[PDB]
Amino acid sequence: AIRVYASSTIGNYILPEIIARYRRDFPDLPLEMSVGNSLDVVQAVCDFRVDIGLIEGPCHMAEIVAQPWLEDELVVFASPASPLLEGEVTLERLAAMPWILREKGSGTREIVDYLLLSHLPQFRLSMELGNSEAIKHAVRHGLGVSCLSRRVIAEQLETGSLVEVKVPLPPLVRTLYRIHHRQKSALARFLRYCEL
Amino acid sequence: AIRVYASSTIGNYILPEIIARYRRDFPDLPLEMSVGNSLDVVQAVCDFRVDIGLIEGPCHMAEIVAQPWLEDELVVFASPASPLLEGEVTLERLAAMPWILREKGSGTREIVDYLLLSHLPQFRLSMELGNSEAIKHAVRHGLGVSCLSRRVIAEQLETGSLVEVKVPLPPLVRTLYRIHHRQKHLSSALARFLRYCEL
Numbered sequence: 001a002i003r004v005y006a007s008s009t010i011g012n013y014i015l016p017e018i019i020a021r022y023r024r025d026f027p028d029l030p031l032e033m034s035v036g037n038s039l040d041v042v043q044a045v046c047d048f049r050v051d052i053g054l055i056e057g058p059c060h061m062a063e064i065v066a067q068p069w070l071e072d073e074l075v076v077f078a079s080p081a082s083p084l085l086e087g088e089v090t091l092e093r094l095a096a097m098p099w100i101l102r103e104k105g106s107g108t109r110e111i112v113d114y115l116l117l118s119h120l121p122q123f124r125l126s127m128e129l130g131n132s133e134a135i136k137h138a139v140r141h142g143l144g145v146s147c148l149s150r151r152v153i154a155e156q157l158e159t160g161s162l163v164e165v166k167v168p169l170p171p172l173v174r175t176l177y178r179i180h181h182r183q184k185s186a187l188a189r190f191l192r193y194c195e196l
Numbered sequence: 197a198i199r200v201y202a203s204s205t206i207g208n209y210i211l212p213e214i215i216a217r218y219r220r221d222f223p224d225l226p227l228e229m230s231v232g233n234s235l236d237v238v239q240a241v242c243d244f245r246v247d248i249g250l251i252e253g254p255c256h257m258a259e260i261v262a263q264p265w266l267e268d269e270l271v272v273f274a275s276p277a278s279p280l281l282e283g284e285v286t287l288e289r290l291a292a293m294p295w296i297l298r299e300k301g302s303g304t305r306e307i308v309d310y311l312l313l314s315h316l317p318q319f320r321l322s323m324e325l326g327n328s329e330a331i332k333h334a335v336r337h338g339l340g341v342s343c344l345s346r347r348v349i350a351e352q353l354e355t356g357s358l359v360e361v362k363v364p365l366p367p368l369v370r371t372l373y374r375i376h377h378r379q380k381h382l383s384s385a386l387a388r389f390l391r392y393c394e395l
């Protein structure tokens with residue numbers, strides 16, 4: 001049996017298909033998947049409840065072995081009818097927007113705090129939501145702007161109900177990590193399917 | 197000064213359109229939205245942390261006033277390659293498929309257990325997932341079968357990545373409840389927001 005805990009982006013937009021490919025080639029092999037945020041994954045790995053954990057924020061703990069797994073780009077997005085789309089986008093223009101952010105303790109919020117909102121002086125924090133679907137649908141209804149992994153809003157980017165905003169910053173690329181406890185099981189068979 | 201705590205189905209697929217229309221005609225008034233599961237909302241209203249709660253499961257707590265608000269139709273669904281799609285679907289066939297269900301404390305978990313899972317004897321619980329999106333894509337890739345609100349899987353029901361399964365049972369309709377504390381009856385500004393939540 002394998003126990004995997006993934007953060008929101010991974011557990012909802014990367015992991016389901018991997019399990020499909022895994023349980024296709026290995027039926028009768030158990031897999032219990034749990035999805036929370038990056039903090040919940042880290043604490044669940046520390047408690048010896050899961051075998052491996054997949055996080056989208058950093059993790060600098062002595063008892064945790066973190067290895068880079070995939071790359072992921074966060075994007076500022078807005079509704080197509082947003083005034084931010086017309087004209088040159090600057091830092092001061094982005095700080096003046098109503099930002100809908102993920103709760104503190106999520107990897108998305110921590111990374112965007114480091115790469116983006118760190119340079120938006122006194123950015124207006126309009127709403128804090130505990131999941132990215134509520135953030136996605138709020139932004140597409142013109143309730144503000146946000147920053148999420150491209151995997152979360154991919155379908156809405158192609159459909160058109162959400163438009164990527166050109167940010168005057170280097171691309172907001174982040175690393176998704178695989179973690180496990182140092183002091184801690186057919187994982188090699190499962191880790192095969194997490195390769196590109 | 198209005199704070200609303202809603203469950204995952206309501207917060208993700210209903211409230212955004214309402215709040216947008218509300219902030220359009222009333223841009224001044226503040227509006228704080230929080231989304232969790234049904235137990236999150238119930239516990240928050242009991243603790244006076246939020247003015248009103250919107251849930252997708254029953255709530256029978258003593259000092260919580262629950263009133264039906266909307267109706268919501270749950271759907272048994274699977275991938276286009278499931279054996280549940282053809283023949284007469286029976287309860288023994290349904291119980292024999294891998295069921296991906298929500299975590300306990302979700303209104304969806306409690307309602308499908310009462311209206312459906314109670315009638316599938318010895319159903320296999322393949323997985324338990326904390327959110328309906330992971331469920332939606334797990335079944336979309338073929339991991340099994342589940343039951344979610346039609347609002348959650350409407351996009352996929354359209355394109356065909358997910359297919360509705362006919363259940364030999366009455367249509368699985370649930371009631372979305374609006375709750376508040378028996379001690380704190382809702383204010384007048386809160387009432388104006390409720391007009392926008394109605395059909």
Ligand SMILES: O=S([O-])[O-]
Nearest residue numbers: 008038106107108
């Ligand atoms: O769920 S993640 O954004 O930590």
Ligand SMILES: O=S([O-])[O-]
Nearest residue numbers: 204234302303304
């Ligand atoms: O998240 S809901 O099912 O309470």
